[PDB]
Amino acid sequence: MNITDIREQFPILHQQVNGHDLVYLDSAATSQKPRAVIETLDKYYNQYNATDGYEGAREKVRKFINAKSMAEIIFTKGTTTSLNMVALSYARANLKPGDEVVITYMEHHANIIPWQQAVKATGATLKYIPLQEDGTISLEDVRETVTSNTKIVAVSHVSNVLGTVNPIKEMAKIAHDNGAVIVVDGAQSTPHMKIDVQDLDCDFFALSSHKMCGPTGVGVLYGKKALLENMEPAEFGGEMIDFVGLYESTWKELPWKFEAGTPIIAGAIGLGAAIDFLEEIGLDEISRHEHKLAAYALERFRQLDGVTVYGPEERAGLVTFNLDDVHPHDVATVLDAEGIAVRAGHHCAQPLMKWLDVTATARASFYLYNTEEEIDKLVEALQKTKEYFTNV
Amino acid sequence: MNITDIREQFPILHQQVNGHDLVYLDSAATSQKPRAVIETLDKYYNQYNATDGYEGAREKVRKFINAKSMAEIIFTKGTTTSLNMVALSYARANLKPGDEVVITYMEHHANIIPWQQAVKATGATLKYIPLQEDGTISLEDVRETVTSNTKIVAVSHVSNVLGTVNPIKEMAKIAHDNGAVIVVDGAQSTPHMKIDVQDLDCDFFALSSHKMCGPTGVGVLYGKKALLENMEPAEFGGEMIDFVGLYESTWKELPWKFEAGTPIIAGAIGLGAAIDFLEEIGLDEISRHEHKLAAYALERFRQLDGVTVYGPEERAGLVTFNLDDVHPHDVATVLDAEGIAVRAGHHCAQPLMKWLDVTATARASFYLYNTEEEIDKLVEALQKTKEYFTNV
Ligand SMILES: Cc1ncc(COP(=O)(O)O)c(/C=N/[C@H](C(=O)O)C(C)(C)S)c1O
Ligand SMILES: Cc1ncc(COP(=O)(O)O)c(/C=N/[C@H](C(=O)O)C(C)(C)S)c1O
């Protein structure tokens, strides 16, 4: 895998910011898109037929995560919408008082609140697997937290703050043994490593196109055919209908049952081209590149005095940290001045922020186009920043 | 208003199809976008901050439809999502057995089925204002159909099939007199004429950005502040939260209560530029251009033997028709061969198709960049088509 060849593909990396080269370290929020993807979306904003392309893209998505059937690949507005859908069509119809839903402390808001509302409405109860010191889950902890009263476990595959890769294959086993389905938020895993939903045996899996070189506006919700068959739709209109009566309507078959309103043609075809691209590079190749960057970043961050890093040693390609004494918003500002783009904030993980005893953090995240030289620029600029602020 | 100057702004109109000039008559499905809008969206797919722009766009939308407050302008995924939201947060919480919801026979599926589900779930009843012969509603009919049991009236401002402009200001009065709110689907009105939600006194109003020179992926739901204040959110996650507890969360204030997940920054800023554009042309100017085209089209269509046109004389800028004997899909195919783009199908109006006793129709729709010369090309090609098929 050749980083020059790859970088040539992202016109945005040639952008100057304030006389410096863009150093783009916010992929966890949005990847950039290569020329192949860009050209594809340009094509679908001139004149067309289209649905060869649309269903073709569903097929590429299905093969990509190794789903058994296209009936199991639904296009949605985003991973937030995906998770809300499972909470409304699956959770609200399968929970009764006494039933438990268990999640983790590391979750995105969209993987917390929909379960909260589903539990309030059904009068069931919500439960949290506790975290280890280093921000990991242990299989012991899940084993203990899941009762044979647990109907749903929901978990991030990769944490967007800690970079922890959760043992989701094993958690699936533990959920099944207790009579539960597992719901996996794969927003942060799918861009960076092979996903095989059969081997993971997750019951639902959600991915975000804009994190994986595709357009925004488009997510995919995977669910097992059999679960999807019994779920009622969350949204109504457009093209999810078979017969519309005056009082009564019938739904289409899967997957179209779940796609109300106006098909996101360009977005899906775009996601498909993004998939074509990543596959031609190899996800394994990508993942090895990210392990190097992450080991490198964590080592060089240990050289810096009074910066805290959060999470485990083994990690996806991101590190969340704080400068002693300095506000993360301020760090982000100064790095911006130098053309270095990191994100500051709570990362829609308020619970987890409280758990780390912090109100905010900065985050640098890495993808297939980042390099060690960029990590050096980050470390040098963090140094320059610690000095610059101990001096006011 | 100068049509050459306007047409110069849409690069897509210079596109050749099969050695002919594009004749684009499917604006009711998607408008095209001018250079100003295109450049704007290009800008937000290079490197950025952003939220000056986002909230700025909400303000431009508010001034555009003359809402009292930004608290009343919610960004959504589309008019389908908008209508589903009102059905779930408003309808399902305000209907009891005995309550009526009344709609029309001309509605889009997304303005039928969500009310069907809301009524099934609350055990209330759904009712239909009957149509006149010419596809119009009469105020008598609404007066008769609304009882002081009616809690919600829902109506298309402009029909996507018939081109009928519904008397929504008056219907608002009739709904209020009976103790009901009105919900208006303005997908087909907003691109073509001034909207003033204070004068119309609608309780909710929904518009689609991609019909009005803006990007797709973005709708606006207007609701009266006071109604919105009591509605509970439909979706949970992202940035609609104030405090996230372990069991219990608080929402942000309006409008952010209603925007779960990841803000559609580029889309909103794009819609704002589309608004800037239309406003610099003048919506009145646009609307007068469309009346000429529509009168012209209906007159030239009357010259054609054995084509049926549907709807009234007074109309928005669209005509839906059928060739005697010829399948609309086939018409669309032949016109495509000549570079003329019309849409064929049921237009997500299955009930209305059944009412007109047809399984499908063809539709030509007009916007600020269309001309009489294009209508001539359509009429000539429809003639060429009637001959071509009486001959097989
Ligand atoms: C784990 C996880 N799940 C869901 C989302 C939301 O994805 P989407 O915007 O497609 O709704 C995200 C998006 N994360 C952004 C980020 O971490 O940069 C966010 C903080 C905007 S949520 C996420 O990390
Ligand atoms: C009256 C009306 N209401 C809602 C919609 C759907 O708008 P949106 O795609 O933003 O969800 C539409 C979209 N109409 C297309 C059309 O008529 O071309 C459609 C048939 C795809 S729904 C519409 O006409």
Tab-separated table of C-alpha atoms and ligand atoms in Angstrom, chain A residues 28-29 78-80 108 160 185 187-188 208 210-211 347-348 363, chain B residues 262, ligand 1:
chain	number	residue	atom	x	y	z
A	28	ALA	CA	-13.284	10.061	12.855
A	29	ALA	CA	-15.733	12.873	12.210
A	78	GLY	CA	-27.188	7.958	9.107
A	79	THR	CA	-26.074	5.776	12.021
A	80	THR	CA	-28.107	7.967	14.396
A	108	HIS	CA	-22.341	7.813	21.606
A	160	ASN	CA	-15.074	7.298	19.160
A	185	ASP	CA	-22.750	0.614	16.304
A	187	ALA	CA	-19.676	3.831	12.629
A	188	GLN	CA	-16.034	3.864	13.770
A	208	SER	CA	-21.831	5.627	8.336
A	210	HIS	CA	-19.135	9.621	5.328
A	211	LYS	CA	-16.593	7.999	7.614
A	347	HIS	CA	-17.724	13.880	21.126
A	348	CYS	CA	-21.380	13.161	21.957
A	363	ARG	CA	-8.972	14.153	19.414
B	262	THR	CA	-25.246	15.132	13.005
C	1	LIG	C1	-19.825	5.985	17.196
C	1	LIG	C2	-20.638	6.888	16.439
C	1	LIG	N1	-21.931	6.590	16.173
C	1	LIG	C3	-22.702	7.458	15.470
C	1	LIG	C4	-22.218	8.659	14.983
C	1	LIG	C5	-23.141	9.418	14.268
C	1	LIG	O1	-23.002	8.887	12.968
C	1	LIG	P1	-24.019	9.508	11.869
C	1	LIG	O2	-23.592	11.040	11.884
C	1	LIG	O3	-23.905	8.853	10.521
C	1	LIG	O4	-25.453	9.663	12.474
C	1	LIG	C6	-20.859	9.004	15.205
C	1	LIG	C7	-20.384	10.239	14.738
C	1	LIG	N2	-19.418	10.715	15.480
C	1	LIG	C8	-18.882	12.038	15.366
C	1	LIG	C9	-17.435	11.995	15.835
C	1	LIG	O5	-17.071	11.200	16.746
C	1	LIG	O6	-16.681	12.778	15.234
C	1	LIG	C10	-19.809	12.868	16.290
C	1	LIG	C11	-19.152	13.295	17.631
C	1	LIG	C12	-20.377	14.015	15.438
C	1	LIG	S1	-21.166	11.898	16.837
C	1	LIG	C13	-20.110	8.103	15.989
C	1	LIG	O7	-18.797	8.319	16.295
